Structure 1
């Protein structure tokens, strides 16, 4: 079933007991933390095999 990704993350937040408005009110920060954490994994794999 298609669903917008920001809405999917708001339900995955609701599954950990955090109210879904916490995502929509912080969506940019949450996206930057995710994007930067994917970034660190390239550096980790490129350094500590």
Structure 2
């Protein structure tokens, strides 16, 4: 329950160092940017997610 917390809460930075504060709606935008999806898809379709 600590690791299920900080994946949603602290992002990916809890195991790589000190835990940052990233809100959750901005976390899925950066995880789309690694696979080649720009932020147009997440913010428009957010009610359908």
Q: Which has the higher helix share?
A: 1
Matches within 5 A, 1:29-48: 29-30=48-49
CA RMSD of aligned residues (A): 0.8
Give the TM-score taking structure 2 as reference length. 0.54
- Misfit runs of 4+, over 4 Å: none
| Unmatched runs of 5 consecutive residues or more in structure 1 | 31-49
**What count of residue pairs does the alignment treat as equivalent?**
30
Give the TM-score taking structure 1 as reference length. 0.54
Larger Rg: 1
